[PDB]
Amino acid sequence: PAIDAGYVSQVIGPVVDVRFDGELPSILSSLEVEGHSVRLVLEVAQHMGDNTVRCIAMDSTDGLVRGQKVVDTGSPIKVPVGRGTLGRIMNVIGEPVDEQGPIDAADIWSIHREAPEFTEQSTEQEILVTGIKVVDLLAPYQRGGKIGLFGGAGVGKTVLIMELINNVAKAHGGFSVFAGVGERTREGNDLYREMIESGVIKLGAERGNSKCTLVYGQMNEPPGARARVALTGLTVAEYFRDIEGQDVLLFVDNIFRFTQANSEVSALLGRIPSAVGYQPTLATDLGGLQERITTTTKGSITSVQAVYVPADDLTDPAPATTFAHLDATTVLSRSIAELGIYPAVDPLDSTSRMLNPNVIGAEHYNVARGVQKVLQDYKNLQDIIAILGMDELSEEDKLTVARARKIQRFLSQPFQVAEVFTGTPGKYVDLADTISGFQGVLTGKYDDLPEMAFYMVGDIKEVKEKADKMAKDIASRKEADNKKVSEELKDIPSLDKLVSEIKEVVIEEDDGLEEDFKAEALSSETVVLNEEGKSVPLPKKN
Amino acid sequence: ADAKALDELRKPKFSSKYLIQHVSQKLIPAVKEWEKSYQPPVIHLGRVLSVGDGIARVYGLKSVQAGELVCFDSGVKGMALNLQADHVGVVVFGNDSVIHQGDLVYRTGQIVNVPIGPGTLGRVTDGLGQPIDGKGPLTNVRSSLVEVKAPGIIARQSVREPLFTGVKAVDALVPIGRGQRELIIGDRQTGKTAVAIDAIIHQKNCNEQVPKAQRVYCVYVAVGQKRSTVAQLVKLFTQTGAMRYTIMVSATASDAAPLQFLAPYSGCAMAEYFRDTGKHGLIIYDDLSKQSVAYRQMSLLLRRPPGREAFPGDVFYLHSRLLERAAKLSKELGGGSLTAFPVIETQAGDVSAYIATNVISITDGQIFLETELFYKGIRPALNVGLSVSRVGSAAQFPGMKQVAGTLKLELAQYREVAAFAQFGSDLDAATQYVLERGARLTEMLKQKQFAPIPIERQTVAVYAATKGFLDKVRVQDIVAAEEAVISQVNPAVFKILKANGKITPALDAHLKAELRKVKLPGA
């Protein structure tokens, strides 16, 4: 009973050394610390060499004493998978963190597995309509593809991932997994409560009719928890792909936080750091996680990952490494966002493998390439326009600057999830309407319309509606002079008649501060522990 | 030398003991004649192996917890960061010039904790909870940990209550929810502190008009500031009366970098007392960009590998595990809240810095304060195109929400036509209208220091500006015009607007009536 129950050798932050006097646990095995305040799971990372394993803590190590009994579980971190996980919130180690009781486990799968083989792969390219103009036009999504949203802290990739949830995850009739990795806990509560409202998550005895399962490793978690919670969400998605055999939607908010968490951990593991500050194993840790997120021949996983860029730096090694793992990379720019254009999608930096005329049709492809040609030509003109003004341009250049400003504003779109703070109701723009409208603005059918008629509208019917309305409001600015409903006898009381209906409050004068406060008696001397573990005052010597 | 071959040396294989017995009769008398030179051996206590750079290596301390307050025998506290096989690396909350090699380290049995409670309310403490205001020890207080984990998903609810700041720009444009986190990001000397000070003074003004549970108890955490600045701020909070509700934690620029790293966690543990017992807290981390610099100092002195700009790599986790404790709790947890105002100084307006973009992707919004608006005298210099608060929106004052959408739209069009014409020669005379209205409104929103306004006197003041009622006044006398409007309007309508929550159509009628008998100074 002593063997294969080892003891804590040294504790450095998220990283625990445990010495096992016989038959060491394997790498990736799960170990349980006995006597901690909470459940502390340690995942074995390395064998250090002297009957010592090197572990990663899935919770805080504050409170670990250097002899503590650590129990090997003989297997990796196994999380509950199945249809009974639908509608629940899980953490990194598969525990319910939504207070709905224990999780109905059809199976429990380890969170570490290999990627599917080369024979298992799927080469099928059908488009996924998102109802977003810039996404559907310029970098269209694949229905079994890895999709990345690249952004720089405040450019809108959580709002884009929520709009993609709202548009896609209702028509798509499968199950969803939301793996929240390293994001705000407030946003996880927001998504959970809005999914209970729209009935995607159902509580109580209706729980089996839920469509989404949430796995959360948010930014208050230690680095070991945020480094493995994406693997937990992957395991929940891979059960539905491999065993239920059906389509999954996996949304991962900030897969960068996985890399950042392993970079926090890797400093204390005794590794020589790679470029900018990262672990030497960035590409292989990221690739081992990303190659599990695929569609095989037996099921589909449509993946949407938000990717954070660290200082608006798209050449940082974590974004530059994760660019090669995606089928559609939607890059959000801060300069686009500062012009008020939302979604702040850089149209000359967002790519897809679907922008291919043999896949989307030559009409869509030619419109998209013409839109990109006009935008790139304006980008080449902007250095002249900023200095010499638009008065120095050619008439051909003035035409392409006007058309490119119109197609820059037309790529912006109101979102249904943004209407609670913008106030403008959102529009779902169909793909045929997107192609037709952008073709019309390309050919010069809508040069009659101003620039701001295109800003934050759905499709080209609404450009002409807003262009009639802006022109219409160019006259109507007055005749709110008299004939009011706000003179003194319309339905109005007097002001003192309004004062007496005020519910007077009683101000309590005592702050309620010592209601049930148990003040402990602080000592005016530092009380410490002597050699016998007994509480004594600090001895008066230096 | 294999461990298979070092394991067989536990078994005795000497086959002759002619000097086991020779020294075992002679070892104790030779040890006894050197007892003047033996320091007493150490097992559960600690002895300092080596101290330097504010990190001591401590031999022994066999039963210390990781992350625990240790006490050096000179009375300086420490924190056991990394327990190693041979030593314990402790981090010294103080100057290491008083720690010697061979000093005794005492375990205290408790992870790093500060005094929290009703009795720390009013006091000026250091980064670890000991008072520095000189008025004695912290009484009516209890000890709680500084590295509590933030509440989870199920322990929260969305922010609903509207947390008035007293700044017209903030309460109209960037409104603050009560469990929200709002970054005050700007350059050096752009009025970052002034917004947070105005919020604290306004909570003093509102705490005496609300019934005992809608009161907000502020905490100001001053990290890396000067001590004279903190003394002047305590003088201001005392003479306004705001020190009745404020805790003031200060780890100043002279203090050790562990104390500056730890002081926001100490202040957060003190304000989480008010979050956890159903009350509401306000916490201001002034220059969280200095806590990041102190943590970078600690990490490079611990020889951890530097990452971007030199920062340790867990400098995101430093601020994320700090600001995630600013929450709004659910009704099963009491319903208390904690609103955070992190402050980040920016170099030359570079929002794309490391710590700046870290804290932007933690907080629920931003308040950008520009040097080009601050030099022109537009104070608070709030960048309206960049400032944002999405969690506090549709959770603000309802009358202010009825008025301020027109204000956000009119400042938006003012920004559009100033983005078109930065030189004045081509006047459309409808572009001149939106220029005159924008110049009226940006004179309306700018205000003076250390005098926050109640929300009904801001609602009426921006009601009188987003409508007509001020176009008689030209561009200069608007600061006196709004004071004349606040003065000459009959003060019953402020009581109806406060009590009802929004402008009712009877109140809109009386308000359109009352804004016509106002003697504007521009005439």
Ligand SMILES: Nc1ncnc2c1ncn2[C@@H]1O[C@H](COP(=O)(O)OP(=O)(O)OP(=O)(O)O)[C@@H](O)[C@H]1O
């Ligand atoms: N709203 C305001 N109206 C008038 N003056 C102001 C206002 N806000 C700040 N000031 C003045 O501007 C100066 C800078 O203010 P403040 O100290 O708030 O900026 P800061 O961002 O804290 O600078 P630092 O971080 O370097 O201390 C102060 O001297 C103050 O008197």
Ligand SMILES: Nc1ncnc2c1ncn2[C@@H]1O[C@H](COP(=O)(O)OP(=O)(O)O)[C@@H](O)[C@H]1O
């Ligand atoms: N489609 C949109 N419409 C309006 N505002 C948006 C939109 N997308 C982003 N924003 C603004 O950008 C801010 C940051 O977006 P968010 O997704 O929260 O940032 P991040 O990209 O860091 O996750 C939001 O608070 C919102 O105000």
Ligand SMILES: [Mg+2]
């Ligand atoms: Mg986000």
Ligand SMILES: [Mg+2]
């Ligand atoms: Mg300041």
